Design a protein around this ligand. Structure first.
Ligand code: SAH
Ligand code: UJH
Ligand code: NA
Ligand code: NA
Length: 216
């Protein structure tokens, strides 16, 4: 299976993607304020790249990679509107990319993890480790399989995520997390087929996992 056409259509606006919330995902913004993001950052499966933009505004040199040319164009457009010189973007397949050997001190996966086939995970993890500087940190925000079923999205259980990532990184923490979005009215039916939590500020959230890891 393949989500390439759906991601490109969502970014072109066929209304904006529900996950393009216009700010970094809150669970990842909390790690930034804790000082967990360091040096040159890779925002892998960056989408519109709100987290790249926030990190570039703080002084980091950032690179965002996405398979969708529309996402890369949107990220470049927003960085240009803000006059950021520090943020760059490229179209690439996270499961098979090169050209950044030992580059990044922090790699962040903001909901890319479940957006590729299960069979692509090993190529992706090999690609990002190859792109990592010594002592690099890695952060993943991903849907929980308890919340998102088998289907187009490859959400994970805690054990599955640990088994996949521990082969490549030293895992510091895996904890429950929320993935925020702005869904249209009536999203997923009435009654709803998914557990969508209503949040303040017109947002919603779905269950997930926040993983923190590093090289060492
Ligand atoms: N193999 C792959 N390589 C790179 N990007 C991919 C990919 N498979 C999916 N993607 C991208 O993964 C992203 C998941 S949506 C999340 C986008 C962004 N990180 C955010 O938090 O808003 C989409 O932009 C999609 O195009
Ligand atoms: C790629 O998974 N995805 C697809 C449709 C959504 O509306 C959505 C909302 C939040 C996060 C991910 C999402
Ligand atoms: Na994909
Ligand atoms: Na929490």
């Amino acid at each position: 299976e393949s989500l390439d056409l759906e991601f490109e259509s969502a970014y072109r606006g066929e209304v904006r993607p529900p996950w393009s919330i216009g700010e970094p995902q809150p669970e990842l913004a909390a790690l930034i304020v804790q000082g967990k993001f360091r040096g040159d950052v890779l925002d892998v499966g960056c989408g519109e790249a709100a987290i790249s933009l926030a990190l570039a505004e703080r002084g980091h040199t950032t690179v965002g990679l996405d398979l969708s040319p529309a996402a890369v164009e949107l990220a470049r457009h927003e960085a240009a509107k803000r006059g950021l010189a520090n943020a760059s973007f490229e179209v690439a397949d996270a499961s098979s990319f090169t050209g950044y050997d030992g580059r990044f001190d922090t790699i962040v996966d903001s909901t890319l993890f479940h957006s590729m086939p299960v069979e692509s995970r090993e190529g992706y993890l090999q690609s990002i480790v190859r792109a990592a500087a010594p002592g690099a940190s890695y952060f993943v925000l991903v849907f929980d399989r308890a919340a998102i079923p088998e289907g187009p999205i490859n959400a994970v259980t805690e054990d599955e995520l640990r088994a996949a990532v521990s082969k490549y990184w030293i895992i510091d923490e895996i904890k429950p997390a929320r993935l925020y979005a702005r869904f249209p009215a009536g999203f997923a039916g009435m009654p709803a087929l998914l557990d969508i939590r209503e949040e303040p500020n017109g947002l919603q959230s779905i269950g997930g996992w926040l993983l923190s890891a590093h090289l060492g």
